[PDB]
């Protein structure tokens, strides 16, 4: 009964689309027509970190807004210090190919990952004075693209095998497995409540994941191309996407709809990283045209530019206190914009 | 700042070690090897990794063999390589359209516009033994004729050489139709018993670096 199943799926999709249309009595762009602007946000390269040699693929900000972790293709993880541009650790990598890097919420651990099909959980607060690989999470069949800690005992992983899986560090076993997507998943972002997380994949779609229950909640299909990087609004209710079709978009869980298209005609490049400012008025987004922009989340018009880089912007993160912005690009440099 | 001085000392030591590690690996050429499973994936040179040496230059190979298909993403990481090694099984005619489409996809990738592609038409002997019995070529093949200036190997049958040059012609034609001189293919014919492949890769890499330098210097 293939025809019956296809008709049922079509009916479900039509009902979902009709509900989406019905729930949209307004566009947030219109509602943002009575809000004051933000103006030109001129940011300067307060610090320039020059440790790396090859390109930089990902980086994460510490919970204290002072420690930075960056992963480059030279097989080196460096835990910087933004306040004094001096390195703390230089974690070597078994696999030179790295596409993700995480920093534990408690500052104890740091995770990596890449084409090696394994997530390595390193230990920073070691009694012996040398960071060591506490465990290797080696259950995946594809290539990892994003790791983000929930606590000191569970790490979530996005792998190009079309599956995301919450892990348990101690047992090194896949505690939960998410098996919904139909293509490579490229990024995920953790909700502040830590009971939820989103993952956007190469099939031009997004899905919110119930970490506890294990079943997805909603599917968003607003993009025309891949979804390289995804962020999560600090409020815990919205997530902004970065796709390869020169488009960044805003989605809201409760509304379950599209809300913005942060795009312009003069940009025909791709978006590699996305982040939100602490108060949510700034949606920073890296771009493939050698530079990274600073978008105003509400008005959606551009409100600045960061032209300090001479290669693809690959990563971008705003501190937990909103006192800095970091941008890593294939130029093997990090710059802390304030 | 009695403690920050030691922090700066740690930073300097880490910078020194990072510089040493970078120095150890700059002078090594990188290659990505990709091809069909039926093809001689691993027999060409005699995630996965491999290393070999030719003329005191270190060649550093790679072989993903970890993802089924849809390479549109992990290929991005390999956009700084010196050459891509493409291996196609010539004997399996029924599995040549897929190989041609894969070559077209590799050639026309936005992140590989500057990366040259080596081509190894592996299983040449098997092709020589496959034409003969029940081998009508599915595409058009009568129209073709061996070029007058052809230089076939001594004791090479006209049927064998016309088939071989037809395969090479298909692949080269797919290569030139869109490439704007930035990157160029380098066809080769190899058998399982062949042992000269390292020299061929070395020559291709030398030519690739030569043309890169010509472009850099506008010469």
């Amino acid at each position, epitope marked *: 009964e293939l025809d019956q199943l296809r008709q049922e799926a079509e009916q479900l999709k039509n009902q979902i689309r009709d509900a989406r249309k019905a729930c949209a009595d307004a566009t947030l762009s219109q509602i943002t027509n009575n809000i004051d602007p933000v103006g030109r946000i001129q940011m300067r390269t307060r610090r320039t970190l020059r440790g790396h040699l090859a390109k930089i693929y990902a980086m994460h900000w510490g919970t204290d807004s*002072r*420690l930075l972790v960056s992963a480059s293709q030279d097989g080196k993880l460096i835990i910087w*210090d933004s306040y004094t541009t001096n390195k*703390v*650790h230089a974690i070597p990598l078994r696999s030179s190919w790295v596409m993700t890097c995480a920093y534990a919420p408690s*500052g104890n651990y740091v995770a990596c990952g890449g084409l090696d099909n394994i997530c390595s959980i390193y230990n920073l*607060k070691t*009694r*012996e*004075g*040398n960071v060591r690989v506490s465990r290797e999470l080696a259950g995946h069949t594809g290539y990892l693209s994003c790791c983000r800690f929930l606590d000191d005992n569970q790490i979530v992983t996005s792998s190009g095998d079309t599956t995301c899986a919450l892990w348990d560090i101690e047992t090194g076993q896949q505690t939960t497995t998410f098996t919904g997507h139909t293509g490579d998943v490229m990024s995920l972002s953790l909700a502040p409540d830590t009971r939820l997380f989103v993952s956007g994949a190469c099939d031009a779609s997004a899905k919110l994941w119930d970490v506890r229950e294990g079943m997805c909640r909603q599917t968003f299909t607003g993009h025309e191309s891949d979804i390289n990087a995804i962020c999560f609004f600090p409020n815990g209710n919205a997530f902004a996407t970065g796709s390869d079709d020169a488009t960044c978009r805003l989605f809201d869980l409760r509304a379950d709809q599209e809300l913005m298209t942060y795009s312009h005609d003069n940009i025909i490049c791709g978006i590699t990283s996305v982040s939100f400012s602490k108060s949510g008025r700034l949606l920073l987004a890296g771009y493939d045209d050698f530079n990274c922009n600073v978008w105003d989340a509400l008005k959606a018009d551009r409100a600045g530019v960061l032209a300090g880089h001479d290669n693809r912007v690959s990563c971008l993160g705003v501190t937990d206190d909103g006192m800095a912005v970091a941008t890593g690009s294939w130029d093997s440099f990090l710059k802390i914009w304030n | *700042s*009695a*403690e*920050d*001085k*030691a*922090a700066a*000392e*740690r930073s300097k*030591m880490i910078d020194k070690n990072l510089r040493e590690d970078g120095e150890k690996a700059r002078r090594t050429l990188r290659l990505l090897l990709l091809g069909a499973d039926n093809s001689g994936k691993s027999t060409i040179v005699k995630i996965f990794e491999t290393k070999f040496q030719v003329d005191k230059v270190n060649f550093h190979m790679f072989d993903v063999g970890g993802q089924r298909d849809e390479r549109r993403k992990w290929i991005q990481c390999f956009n700084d390589v010196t050459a891509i090694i493409f291996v196609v099984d010539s004997s399996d005619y029924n599995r040549l359209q897929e190989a041609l489409n894969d070559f077209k996809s590799i050639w026309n990738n936005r992140w590989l516009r500057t990366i040259s592609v080596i081509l190894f038409l592996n299983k040449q002997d098997l092709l020589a033994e496959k034409v003969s019995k029940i081998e009508d070529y599915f595409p058009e093949f009568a129209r073709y004729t061996t070029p007058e200036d052809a230089t076939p190997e001594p004791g090479e049958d006209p049927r064998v050489t016309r088939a071989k040059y037809f395969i090479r012609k298909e692949f080269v034609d797919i290569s030139t139709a869109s490439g704007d001189g930035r990157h160029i293919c380098y066809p080769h014919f190899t058998c399982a018993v062949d042992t000269e492949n390292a020299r061929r890769i070395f020559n291709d890499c030398k030519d690739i670096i030569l043309q890169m330098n010509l472009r850099e210097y506008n010469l």
Partner: single-chain antibody
Amino acid sequence: VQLVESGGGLVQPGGSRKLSCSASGFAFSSFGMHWVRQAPEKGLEWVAYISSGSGTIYYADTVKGRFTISRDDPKNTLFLQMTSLRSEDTAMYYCVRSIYYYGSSPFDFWGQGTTLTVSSADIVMTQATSSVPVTPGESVSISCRSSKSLLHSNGNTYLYWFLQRPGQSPQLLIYRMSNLASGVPDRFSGSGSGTAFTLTISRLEAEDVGVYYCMQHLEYPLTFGAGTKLEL
């Protein structure tokens, strides 16, 4: 982790003898090393300092030149060669480790030291009393005063507390006047106003009996304070 110190014995005044420390169970190369002396039935006194790479050496005002500190990374052995020995130098020298990066815990582990027996601008720091009788489960707070303010511009107060239980080596309880080190009970707490800090214990126990100590790690000299004898 464990450190060992070699030496001990008797040396005629004016003679010489070298102390060697052996390490086992940590990355000696990424860690600095310290020497702290203690005359019998007396307080502590910082002796020397050798950092990773041996590119930063400090000496005490009363050891410089005579005593030299050298570390051998390949075979994990540390030496503090001594030339001139006098009666005032009869003290059982200890060794201490310290790694200096943000979030570090300097002066984390202490060896056992070897008993050596011989036949003005510094940041002075004073401790109120020599002894304080107490009772179990009682919270006794020590007082300590800093001649110079220890809140360096970067916002950190550089005060380290310690505990030399009877017949053992010092164990670090507080390393920057606020932070509690690993492996010590949560009862210990640190407080500070900016010039004179205090150390507190929620409930005195058997293991909490000993002599406490303080550090002034703002500048190259490291001044200790006369310990306070806690008993019951």
